[PDB]
Amino acid sequence: AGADEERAETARLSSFIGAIAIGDLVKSTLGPKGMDKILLSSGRDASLMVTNDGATILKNIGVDNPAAKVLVDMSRVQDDEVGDGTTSVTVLAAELLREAESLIAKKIHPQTIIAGWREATKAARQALLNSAVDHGSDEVKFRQDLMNIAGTTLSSKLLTHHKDHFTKLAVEAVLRLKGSGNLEAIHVIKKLGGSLADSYLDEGFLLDKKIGVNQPKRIENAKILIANEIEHAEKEKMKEKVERILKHGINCFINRQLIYNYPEQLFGAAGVMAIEHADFVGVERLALVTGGEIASTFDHPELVKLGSCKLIEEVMIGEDKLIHFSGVALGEACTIVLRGATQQILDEAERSLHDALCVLAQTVKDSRTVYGGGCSEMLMAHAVTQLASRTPGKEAVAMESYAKALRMLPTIIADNAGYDSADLVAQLRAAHSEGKTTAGLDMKEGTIGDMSVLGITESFQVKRQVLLSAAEAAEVILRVDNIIKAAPR
Amino acid sequence: AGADEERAETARLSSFIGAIAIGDLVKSTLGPKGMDKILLSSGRDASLMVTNDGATILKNIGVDNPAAKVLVDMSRVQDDEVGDGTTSVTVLAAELLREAESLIAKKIHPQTIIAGWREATKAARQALLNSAVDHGSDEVKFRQDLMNIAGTTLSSKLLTHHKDHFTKLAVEAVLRLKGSGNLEAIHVIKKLGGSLADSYLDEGFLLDKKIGVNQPKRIENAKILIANTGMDTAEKEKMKEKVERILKHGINCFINRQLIYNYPEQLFGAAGVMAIEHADFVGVERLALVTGGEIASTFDHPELVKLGSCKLIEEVMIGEDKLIHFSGVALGEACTIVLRGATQQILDEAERSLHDALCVLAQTVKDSRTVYGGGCSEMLMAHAVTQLASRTPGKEAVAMESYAKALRMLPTIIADNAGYDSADLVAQLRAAHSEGKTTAGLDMKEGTIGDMSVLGITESFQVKRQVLLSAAEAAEVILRVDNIIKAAPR
Amino acid sequence: AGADEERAETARLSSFIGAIAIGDLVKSTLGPKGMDKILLSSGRDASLMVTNDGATILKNIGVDNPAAKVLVDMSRVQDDEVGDGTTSVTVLAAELLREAESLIAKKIHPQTIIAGWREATKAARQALLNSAVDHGSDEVKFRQDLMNIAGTTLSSKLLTHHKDHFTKLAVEAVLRLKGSGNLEAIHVIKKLGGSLADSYLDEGFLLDKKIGVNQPKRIENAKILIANTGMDTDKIKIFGSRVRVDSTAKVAEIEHAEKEKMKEKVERILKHGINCFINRQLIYNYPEQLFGAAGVMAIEHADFVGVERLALVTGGEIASTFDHPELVKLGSCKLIEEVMIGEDKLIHFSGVALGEACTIVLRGATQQILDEAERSLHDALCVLAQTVKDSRTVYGGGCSEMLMAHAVTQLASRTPGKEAVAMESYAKALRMLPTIIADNAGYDSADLVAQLRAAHSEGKTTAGLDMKEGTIGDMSVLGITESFQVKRQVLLSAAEAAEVILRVDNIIKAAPR
Amino acid sequence: AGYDSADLVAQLRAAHSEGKTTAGLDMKEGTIGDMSVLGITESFQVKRQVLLSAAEAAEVILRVDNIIKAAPR
């Protein structure tokens, strides 16, 4: 058939090893007490980088023969569709592999055991109806705008010491997006000058370029232009540009590419501020804001061009000479500007803000969430334990292993917190058994507490896709025989 | 003292490895189509030791540097008054070490988990009771007499074909023991011959010796004489004392624990008195309780200092070579069982088989309590304990949940050696117990689940009561003990 | 997956080892009698680089595999804020690890220990403003101007035999600068000759470059020209390649093209009256002959840092291509001249219209050590800009550290135990600074540590480690003090970086982008 | 199926021997069942060709020793 057949015990082991490696590292990451980590490697890497988000680093590398990369690749779809919050989806899938050793004792066809997963699909559906997560997230909403899930996503991120404040800012941005506009015109930048607030919210769009040292410093009632024998001929390009420019009153020129030197002398004298190699992403986002235009050839000026005219200027906000575009007539799209002690860590704040935007959009639209901190998780575990006993035939071992699988999740949250796991697991279990869905793992507390007070809630999509996916990922590998990675090659 | 340094994670591994190696050899044994193992060791051993019973072989040898012998030594105490059923206390303890991998991840205090065994003390206790246990064995019992636990004890042993019939016989033996006598006085041996019955139960004590080719076939209203001092030692005068007062007592049989002088033998044949040369001492001491005893001194020994039961002593065909049977004892307290076999020396298996089987029957009569057999007791308990783990407080529950999964192995082990698929069996079994039918259990003959009560299989209440208490203490002193070195292995 | 796993204690050990190895080299660095380490390398390194300043050497090279480079990188940010005195912050972080041996004995998750660092911010924070400090320099100040911290900064440096005098000189320079912002226009350069003074103070900016021997000696009402682009012309848009031609004829046209560049430079030049030209980079030879005839002095490859400081001083320039002359450029005009006063000839720019910017010139020694003074003065200058702005400082010589140790011992017991086990470990960390200070001094550290604690315990903030005596004395008489900024920032930096590595067992995932 | 192969063989043979053509392997069942109720039937062409083809397959074993190629190295 080729090479590396792996269809039985020698194949299962390869699956088994990949899952154990990922679980300990992803373990410290979860919730408010999640921990920042870096990696040491040699060969075109440069240094040790710290990525709090588990998904970002896994996509980046594929160091060894054993598999995990294909399992990892799937996690992106969950992130695309709903995102992150905390990383638990990979962990849950990894731990059920341990029962496979028990399964050899079972000593029969792996697939019959696999029937437990249709029931696992049931666990997702049965638990969702059993665990009253929330019925809130009305729209906009006063306090519930944040100090909830975004804080939790960020809490695992070290930047949370002052960052949680900017996390709060991001929901204000999501509420305005919702409805008639679409997912457009959202951009974020950071600045070296710093304040306690750590951020200013701009009504328009933030850009950082200058035409040249010469040119008018500030422009008012600005018009915006966006563009997609030989020596004498060159002069002709110069002349066409000047005649069209003066009539419009053009105060600013934005072009997405390289800009020719001849026009530049003219712009200074004319009183027009132009930007060299402006980024396309900023321009497109800007077009919704300024009404845009059709960016054809130099005929482009006047009516074919639509330019907003409130106020465009290059200002000092602290240290760097940034240019601020503000005064949007449309109102549909806005820009958020971040500040924060200037460093590599500040880049990390950029990472989690993206996380905040994605989580909020889904939470309002899905109309559902789950209790975080493992609250849903332990409760569901209590319900599933009874189920293993109920089933006859081969169902009982499979269901049983699935039921005990839920138990590790409480353990992972407590252990990252660092409070003693033995003590934590049962105390936790007693509270869920009682019937209080709100109660769960409180990492800050060191024991168990009320999750709802914390405000930690998870998007409904994150829990349903993971349960079906984690389950499916685990048993594709047992039956593998000759794919991309596994262990020996 | 000690000597072997191994510090943290390495020391734990030594304890871990010993438990896994022992479990595979004992695992085959634990069921109806159990497996027999024969062991050969170089010099320092004569040869031939094959043992079906796990406890007997572990006690005998210390094969290598890692230590399992101290864990092994403890099993005897369990064996003496509860005995066995099947060896399994050691198996359950071994699987406990697997959780230790979870413990390194836990990386806190390895002793903290130990509170779990304290949990084990009441979890096992609570659970044995929150099940239905037999309520049978009224007294004597027609059908319920056997085809029960003994059948399970036999199951491990290769014998169970013809043999399940043999164990049926063993309960008949308990019924005769029944009273204030407690457990003692039962001895059984194997004979090399072929019969469907494969065993014969006789009313008295079985001894295999003969005076000589000559002598009466049997004696009636027999008087039995036991002498400490030998007949071997003018010669005629010794002969005269022996005959003149022997006639007086009406002597019908003489048993001496040593060599016997030839002159007496000519005398005994004409007289009508049967004597036994070099009779084993152990047979003699039991016989004395049976016959009322005597005082064994010099030839003054006959008459009043001697007491003798008088029903029937004869040499009876056992289908092969001659045996001599003592019977009709007035006391009734002591009785003997005779086994027959193929000639395998896999029949010595019967001796160990016998030892574990006999202890169970005596306990069942005295305790007036038992549990359902065939693993019925074990699965139901597993159902109760899973709920219990979530039910209990912090430290106590994590260990309690692990303890609960231990019960799972017994159903699998019973079935695995049966010759049926373990996977189908384990899972099918749980639904029956879960439903609330305690009688239902593993029916190995069936290959599925069946009514244990019709079979009647029940286990002594003590065997379930003490395996769980003993297992907790031994399991507990493995994870928490580091240096562990004393006499024998290590 | 997996990238570099050694399993538990060993993982911790790599973090441990990185901290211990660095501490011994930085150890000799602190105190009045400092030691200089001479470092030589092959492959793109010219000669042995000797850096007294610990931060500068760590930044230059990342020699090996163990993790510690990132911890090192952070210290530079501190340098802009205040930075130096003596290198000590790296040492404190290192000794923190030594309590890790205690941590295995702790038998609990490391993170509980970790809450201690935010607490550590508290412990160290209590110490600031719990140890008197200095009321502050009134402004300018007759005697407290120096003979203080700069001497300590230079303590670590060998040149202190005459250097401490140099240090005294530096505050005079800072008095004119005194914070109307951060810090601009301070330039210092050495010369190859010996004098008892070993330095002179100049009203203007000192530079040392010359166009050539030819050109007028003196220029007045000087016009200054600064060009971003080099005078050099040839490579162009398209190389034309490595050519060759039919015998001799065409190659001459290439020579002709050059003349147009020469002429544009002179035509624009004569109208302005240009007295001096300064270019940051390579200069082209053809114009050089031209400047000599005109009577204009130009500077080849002038350093960029000098040029920008010069721009505020001269009113600035808009630097572009050869259209640069006339109005787009502004030129201050007093006197630019080559006077030479000492050994090596130099050019003095003076009488700047702005008045904001002034320059300092150092002298003496003339060897490997003198070359050191380039980064030595900058270390002194950065501290001073902060000192007037802060209006607050703390006693030097380790006075601050022992007092803090007494307070922190109480804290471990005072707080509930989970917090409690590690405040003390943080607390004992402060003990090493007194020990490191004393060891380089040349006196026995144990005795030194011993005499030190009683003074601080007693209640005298002024009392500290006197390395020169070898005993304990009054720091205030010495005048040595540390800036307020060095203490608040280091404590925050130590808190984040030191134990996050401990709470993590040899890292997890990365090698990305 | 997920059921033990050994058990399956014996039970299957007894039903066919008896005379019920409809009866066959029921994998969901783990034993034997009525194939017709499922509705599972196989095309006549697949069965006639395989048997003649099969003979040829059995026809290429022992009579042929080694002899390797069809496609580049």
UniProtKB/Swiss-Prot annotation, chain B:
Its main location: cytoplasm. Its EC number is 3.6.1.-. The modification Phosphoserine is found at residue 47. ATP binds at residues 31, 85-87, 459, 464. It is found in: Cytoplasm. The keyword Transit peptide does not apply. It is an enzyme of class 3 (hydrolase). One of its GO terms (molecular function) is ATP-dependent protein folding chaperone. It catalyses: ATP + H2O = ADP + phosphate + H(+). This is T-complex protein 1 subunit beta. It comes from Bos taurus.
